[PDB]
Amino acid sequence: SAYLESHRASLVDSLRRLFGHPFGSFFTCLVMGITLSLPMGLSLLLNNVERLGGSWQRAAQISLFLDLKTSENQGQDLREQIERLPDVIEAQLISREQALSELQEQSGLGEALKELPENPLPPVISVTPKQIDRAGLEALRQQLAELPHVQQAQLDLVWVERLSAILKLGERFVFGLTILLVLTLLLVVGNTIRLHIENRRNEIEVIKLVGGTDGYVRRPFLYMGALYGLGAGILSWALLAYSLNWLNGSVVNLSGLYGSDFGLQGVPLDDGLSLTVGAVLLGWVGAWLAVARHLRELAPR
Amino acid sequence: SAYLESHRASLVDSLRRLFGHPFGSFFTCLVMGITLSLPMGLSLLLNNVERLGGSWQRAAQISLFLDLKTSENQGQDLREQIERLPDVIEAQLISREQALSELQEQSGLGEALKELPENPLPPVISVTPKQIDRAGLEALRQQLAELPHVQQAQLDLVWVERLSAILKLGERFVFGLTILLVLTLLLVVGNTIRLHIENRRNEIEVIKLVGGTDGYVRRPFLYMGALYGLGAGILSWALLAYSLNWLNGSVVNLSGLYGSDFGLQGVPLDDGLSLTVGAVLLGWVGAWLAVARHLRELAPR
Amino acid sequence: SGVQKQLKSTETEMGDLEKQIKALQDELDKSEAELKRLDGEKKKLQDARIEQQRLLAIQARAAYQSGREEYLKLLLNQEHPEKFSRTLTYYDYINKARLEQLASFNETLRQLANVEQDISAQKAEQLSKQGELDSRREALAATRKERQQA
């Protein structure tokens, strides 16, 4: 119909009110921006750290040392069969000549078999699982102990149990911190929007006293909430990038010392769009809750 | 004279305003408290880590690999000689028999020393310095090279560095996080009080239009700020005391897995008292600035 | 002819016995040559099993020198701690393989014990043959007496 005039009037009124006394609006926008930037920054840092997830795993691999007499084709066959297990990531096959050099490098003793007729080092393989725990690893070792050609399985149980604890400690910390940050953001946005809505009461009273309707009294507050959300999103998206750029000056040195490039790249445009959309939606929901409270308080009873 | 009467009237008015609206003025009291948990938190966590000073040290230990044939009393004498020399913390000697026991504890390298006539294993000494740097520790190793009964020093220079670099990243991260949390705490505390104060820009005008002393218009707002500060402090104390108890359910397990017993201790009573006073002082400061804006634009002009 | 012919017959018998006596010195020389041959073999065999202590000491020192590593400084230094646990069982295999080498040295020691008990038996035989030469020495003393009558 011809109700677009309502939207036009609401939007121009919201812009006029927002552009008056700029500092009051700017401080609120900046507070919401920082409060939203915190959890988003944590999530982005976690995602960036996730790129190197292969190093955390593959640390406690179960050895499946074979017998001294083994056909090479049989070795590849057992490699393929172990690869078929649903609970294994990767399989390998180290050779005797490679094993000798591996022992020589770490041992530092150099010459080993001075007066020994033949090499007794048997062919060896490696197996890596998805998850690390004291029970699943023991169960998988028991499963692998009855293969056609296996004689030992040297898993260091004292270490594998420590690895499970040293990884579970990190998970709970992140979980609790995420919960706390989300709660803080929700409370801050809700309270700020509630205060701004409570500032205007006589308007609602007069509009409801005269013949009105819910939409015609609710629209301007929705527009104001949307504008505050967009402002907070823009402010937040222009500060997290600077923080990541400042922090990137130190991580590159450590990455170079390890001998690799792990530059902290941040704020892709998709993430910025998601952030601003989320801020707008949060403001829009907060405004609709705040208006609904006052509207319910004026029930005829 | 009349000071006490007005002061009591202001206190009673503030209490009536605070308790007059249950289910309201409590979300404010909770948001002003939870946002105080974040910056006051991570300070107890940092203190608890700093208490555990044996992990940052004793991680890059120079191994003074002593000669094969040396009398035990002479080795002990070298022990206190190193102990008194600076740039160290503790020096300990390991007996040959204890060395054999440690080597025999592993499944490998056993059931063969009995055939061997005597122990070839020489005593060792561990030395823990204070500073962790490439040049200083290299000079320390060079100075410890020239001793009458030392064979070789065993330390990895690539590991001497690459450890002073991981610490720097943590320091910079902690510094940035502290700055970011302090700024958001201050901004939230200021903004919420500003929003509450602005809703009463009619009492100030009437009080000033009639003859009114400067402190008479400021006192009730100061009380309103102080009460909110106290409530936020109490809530922050409770939330920290619960969250740290939640967290302490896993770190004790990891500490017990190794040979030690370390656990996160709860909030000390002195620290708790210092927390609930550090939140009251935001009142009488936030209020003293929120009312200072209306008090300067209503001045003659 | 009693002085001449009877003494000549005894001298001829003494010479016939002396032929086998020279033969037994010859076999004695052969036995002594093989005795020092076996003695040198035992000495060179006892030269072995000394490299046993040498190599065992080297491996023990190497194991102690790299057998003390907190695993948290292995993962953080790109030492790929997948190893340092395989090489523990590699050391177990090399210690059982050096135990097989030492079992070859136990073959050495048992062969030495056997080639010491039986070689002591050939020293008993050596005493017996010294005794039988002691029996086979009065022939020259007799020949000295019956030389005059010839």
């Binding site: 011809a2 006589n202 005269v210 013949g211 009105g212 309707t213 005829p300 | - | -």
Partner: protein
């Protein structure tokens, strides 16, 4: 068509309130209700606007049971009853031209003629040449005239009033009385209330007297 049939309302904690008040059907003529206004008589006015549901009794003004009314359809009723209260409230920080003629925007009309309609409406009242000043800094009495004119800009089928010219200049009361009579000429039910005997003795009233929450007696054209 204002109809009452033994209505009675009681505050849960305030006081005892009103009891068993009834009237008959009517259309397009003046009808006083004020009688004696020793106690707060705004309860009836509030009850008309469906702001507070009655405690007891039944009533209907357009064939609708006000006792059973839903919040969804309540504002479709309050859209055609111009109402002026005693302690009138106005939208501060908004121009008087936009403050008045507010119901027109809810009703929905093209913008250009709203200006001429509101100009005629404000010209009907003696106030003029102050169509842009804020409600603040405006002299009292003129702003209550603005509040009165808020309920007259459009064309309502019913009009209400609490206490016009309760303490105003009696000379100025003639203008608003003429305005009420003129809007009655087109046909508008009026339930004006007041407390001045000399004025209420005129304009051919049909008043009723209420006291202690109940109708006392009938004073037909005194």
């Amino acid at each position: 068509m204002i109809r009452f049939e033994q209505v009675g309302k009681r505050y849960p904690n305030g006081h005892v309130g009103l009891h068993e008040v009834s009237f008959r059907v009517h259309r397009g003529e003046i009808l006083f209700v004020t009688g004696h206004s020793g106690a707060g008589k705004s309860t009836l006015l509030r009850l008309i606007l469906a702001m507070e549901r009655p405690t007891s009794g039944k009533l209907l003004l357009g064939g609708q049971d006000l006792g059973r009314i839903t919040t969804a359809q309540i504002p479709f009723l309050r859209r055609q009853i111009g109402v002026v209260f005693q302690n009138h409230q106005l939208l501060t920080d908004r121009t008087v031209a936009d403050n008045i003629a507010l119901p027109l925007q809810i009703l929905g009309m093209p913008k250009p003629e709203i200006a001429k309609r509101v100009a005629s409406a404000l010209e009907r009242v003696n106030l003029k040449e102050k169509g842009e000043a804020l409600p603040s800094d405006l002299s009292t009495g003129q702003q209550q005239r603005v509040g009165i004119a808020r309920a007259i800009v459009h064309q309502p089928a019913l009009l209400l009033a609490d206490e016009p010219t309760g303490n105003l200049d009696p000379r100025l009361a003639s203008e608003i009385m003429g305005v009420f009579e003129d809007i009655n000429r087109l046909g508008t039910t009026v339930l004006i209330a007041s407390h001045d005997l000399a004025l209420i003795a005129r304009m051919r009233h049909r008043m009723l007297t209420l006291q202690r929450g109940r109708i006392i007696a009938d004073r037909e054209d005194e």
